[PDB]
Scaffold this motif. Sequence first.
Motif, PDB file in Angstrom:
ATOM      1  N   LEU A  18       0.820  -1.205   0.000  1.00  0.00           N
ATOM      2  CA  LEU A  18       0.000   0.000   0.000  1.00  0.00           C
ATOM      3  C   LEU A  18       0.856   1.258   0.000  1.00  0.00           C
ATOM      4  N   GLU A  92     -12.359   7.245  -9.171  1.00  0.00           N
ATOM      5  CA  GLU A  92     -11.856   7.726  -7.883  1.00  0.00           C
ATOM      6  C   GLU A  92     -12.020   9.244  -7.754  1.00  0.00           C
ATOM      7  N   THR A  97     -11.783  10.505  -0.833  1.00  0.00           N
ATOM      8  CA  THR A  97     -11.426   9.140  -1.186  1.00  0.00           C
ATOM      9  C   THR A  97     -10.170   9.165  -2.046  1.00  0.00           C
ATOM     10  N   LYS A  99      -8.167   5.942  -1.918  1.00  0.00           N
ATOM     11  CA  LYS A  99      -7.682   4.577  -1.760  1.00  0.00           C
ATOM     12  C   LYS A  99      -7.378   3.930  -3.106  1.00  0.00           C
ATOM     13  N   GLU A 102      -3.800   4.304  -4.620  1.00  0.00           N
ATOM     14  CA  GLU A 102      -2.660   3.533  -4.141  1.00  0.00           C
ATOM     15  C   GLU A 102      -2.624   2.140  -4.750  1.00  0.00           C
ATOM     16  N   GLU A 219     -10.976  -1.568  -5.768  1.00  0.00           N
ATOM     17  CA  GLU A 219     -10.736  -2.390  -4.587  1.00  0.00           C
ATOM     18  C   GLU A 219     -11.538  -3.682  -4.642  1.00  0.00           C
ATOM     19  N   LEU A 248      -9.923  -0.716   2.914  1.00  0.00           N
ATOM     20  CA  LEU A 248      -9.001   0.407   2.900  1.00  0.00           C
ATOM     21  C   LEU A 248      -9.704   1.651   3.419  1.00  0.00           C
ATOM     22  N   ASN A 250      -9.275   5.954   4.212  1.00  0.00           N
ATOM     23  CA  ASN A 250      -8.582   7.229   4.089  1.00  0.00           C
ATOM     24  C   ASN A 250      -9.020   8.115   5.241  1.00  0.00           C
ATOM     25  N   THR A 260      -3.568   6.661   4.444  1.00  0.00           N
ATOM     26  CA  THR A 260      -4.360   5.551   3.939  1.00  0.00           C
ATOM     27  C   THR A 260      -3.864   4.282   4.612  1.00  0.00           C
ATOM     28  N   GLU A 262      -5.053  -0.045   5.579  1.00  0.00           N
ATOM     29  CA  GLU A 262      -5.967  -1.173   5.552  1.00  0.00           C
ATOM     30  C   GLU A 262      -6.316  -1.565   6.975  1.00  0.00           C
ATOM     31  N   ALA A 326     -13.996   6.831   3.418  1.00  0.00           N
ATOM     32  CA  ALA A 326     -13.063   7.948   3.443  1.00  0.00           C
ATOM     33  C   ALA A 326     -13.457   8.858   4.597  1.00  0.00           C
TER      34      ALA A 326
ATOM     35  N   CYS B 189       1.423   7.953   0.805  1.00  0.00           N
ATOM     36  CA  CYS B 189       0.214   8.093   1.599  1.00  0.00           C
ATOM     37  C   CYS B 189       0.351   7.522   3.003  1.00  0.00           C
TER      38      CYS B 189
END
Lengths: 431, 213, 87
Positions: A18, A92, A97, A99, A102, A219, A248, A250, A260, A262, A326, B189
């Motif tokens: 990630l 996205e 948001t 995620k 990445e 995702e 995931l 944010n 970010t 998981e 998010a 990030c």
Amino acid sequence: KKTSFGSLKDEDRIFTNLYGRHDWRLKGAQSRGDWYKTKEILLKGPDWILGEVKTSGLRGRGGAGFPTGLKWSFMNKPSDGRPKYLVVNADEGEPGTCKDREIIRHDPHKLVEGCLVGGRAMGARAAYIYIRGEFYNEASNLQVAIREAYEAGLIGKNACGSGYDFDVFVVRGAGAYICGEETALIESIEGKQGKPRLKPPFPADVGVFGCPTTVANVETVAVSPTICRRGGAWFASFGRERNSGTKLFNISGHVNNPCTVEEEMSVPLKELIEKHAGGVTGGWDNLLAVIPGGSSTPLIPKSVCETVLMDFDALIQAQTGLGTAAVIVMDRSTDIVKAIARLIEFYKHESCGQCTPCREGVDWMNKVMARFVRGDARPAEIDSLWEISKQIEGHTICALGDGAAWPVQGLIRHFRPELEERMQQFAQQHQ
Amino acid sequence: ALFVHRDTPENNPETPFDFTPENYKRIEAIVKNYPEGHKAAAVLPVLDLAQRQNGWLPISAMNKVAEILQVPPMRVYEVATFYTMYNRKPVGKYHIQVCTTTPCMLRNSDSILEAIQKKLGIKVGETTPDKLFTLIEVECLGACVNAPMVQINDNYYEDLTPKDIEEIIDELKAGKIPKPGPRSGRFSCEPAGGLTSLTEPPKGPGFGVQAGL
Amino acid sequence: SGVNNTKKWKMEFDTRERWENPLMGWASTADPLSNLVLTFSTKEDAVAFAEKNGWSYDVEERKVPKPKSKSYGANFSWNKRTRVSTK
Ligand SMILES: Cc1cc2nc3c(=O)[nH]c(=O)nc-3n(C[C@H](O)[C@H](O)[C@H](O)COP(=O)(O)O)c2cc1C
Ligand code: SF4
Ligand code: FES
């Protein structure tokens, strides 16, 4: 049965690159378990693959949370002469948001492999990946990974030595949040304005180029290969019931360490902020409100954030939603009215203009909220604004109309005293 | 911000535009990505290609893409006006795009916006007299956790302070190409102050695979 | 698009001369029936009325719009010309 969720172990994390601390290209991804026994997965058939997604409890990660296995099985039918496609939603665009970005740039080979496995389950001949045009460098990473997979026989003719043919295409957007909507995405790939279609027909019958199509989030697509390798039952051992798996998150806004990360589904929102984001700026007691699942979800006050879990059902009962998960954190020094007004301005700028309640209603709510920020309104306008948002909600073609009404309703629901107080300040200043 | 066109000496249907010989090969690959009989699917990637060659889209550039794909020009005009990344007026060599949506606004993107105006002397929406820079606000660019951020051309510059963005403008004025990514102490990030996850070595091929393949 | 004025039968009479009033230019007429319009539930009722009053009449058959087959999904046809180029 499990009762408390969180503290996800590193061995049970799917997006293991990630943060990009390892080689994102094929050599690195393969060494981390990607592209392993994909041939064996493909040869087990679409019914088997769809069974593992159904058992895993996976739900759409794009914002709506539809059960993924049930949705993907809509395309499990015989050909009627047309090609069948998988469209991966990498637009996205939802504010807050980030995620999906990445995954595309650090874990590209999970997305490519997910396209093949997910594409097999649907009988699709190819996958078109729609990435927003602003992600130029991430789109370029994805193309490099795709070329590597082609040059190794993993995708294309006889993918993975499976006898299955699969192409992965990357198409870039041109700057429009609405093109993340599933039918507006299809209209954009076809070369038109990004304007959503009415339903029916559903995309699984008449989709991109008028062909059976499934639109899936990055995702959602990028976890299916792992669900098949490790089994849907392993995935179902996380989170509450009907909220399975890893997710995931944010965390942005007024936290010490925006990031970010998981984490397990149904993790308490307080724990997620404290453990990973370094707490609310100024201490937890400085928290004012949280937008838990992107700008489309209603805000919730600090009194609801103390115990709320982060899953589809827990947040629905808190009168909001998980959305894209998010988290936007607003500490006690935020002008809450202005923050929400800037969201309505965003929705005003993003509406496609196709249908009346959003083309006119969202713009109308933007003008009212601009006055609410200054206090240049009457208290009776608050109930009018609530009623106006209810006329937009549930009456539009797509959900962008709903997504503009909800943040307004969240504000009026939990911060009416702040609205009325500001109007009373403005009235006395001009008397 | 006008969605009607009036011909002008530098923007009219006779304004010279055509793809380079190299860009015609790129167009051929773009067209082949779509089913036969649906070449109109290539409108967005081909207009974007013309923008990359020319920097902006004159009405003649839109008329050229319409001809090559055998599409009505109006349908090309609709795409150009609909999508915000298409420039229907010339912009400076560096198109600076500051995100002002709420997640970035909460991390003081106002300060970033103010710094750029102070250094360049222009306002939002304007181009510097030397035509080097253009400044606009934009909606969320999908880099929310790295806010405040800006996009200059294809590059994201993230975790900005007023000093950071001022340096970036200085590096650009000298012809240099500043490194994209966060200007804070992190790489992408991840949480600032050390990782709170993914600190073990990743498990290799075959880990945790259910029996029966 | 409203169809509520196509429900009932009407009886009208033939148009006769109108001329300009010399003083003001208004439209003068010598036809006492110029503005006479009668409404009937059915064609037979209108025809029965015309016979007993001794008027020669012409009956025009009612025109009902032909039923149409509408398909929103046809706008996005894979291989037919009904595929729309814009929305
Ligand atoms: C205005 C709007 C924007 C959306 N943007 C995205 C997006 O950027 N990414 C995404 O995956 N889904 C987005 N969606 C949701 C999609 O319409 C759709 O539900 C989703 O892509 C389905 O994939 P999933 O089942 O895997 O979640 C958006 C919806 C709306 C109404
Ligand atoms: S709700 Fe808004 S974005 Fe969605 S179709 Fe209607 S006008 Fe377009
Ligand atoms: S709010 Fe600025 S990048 Fe998302």
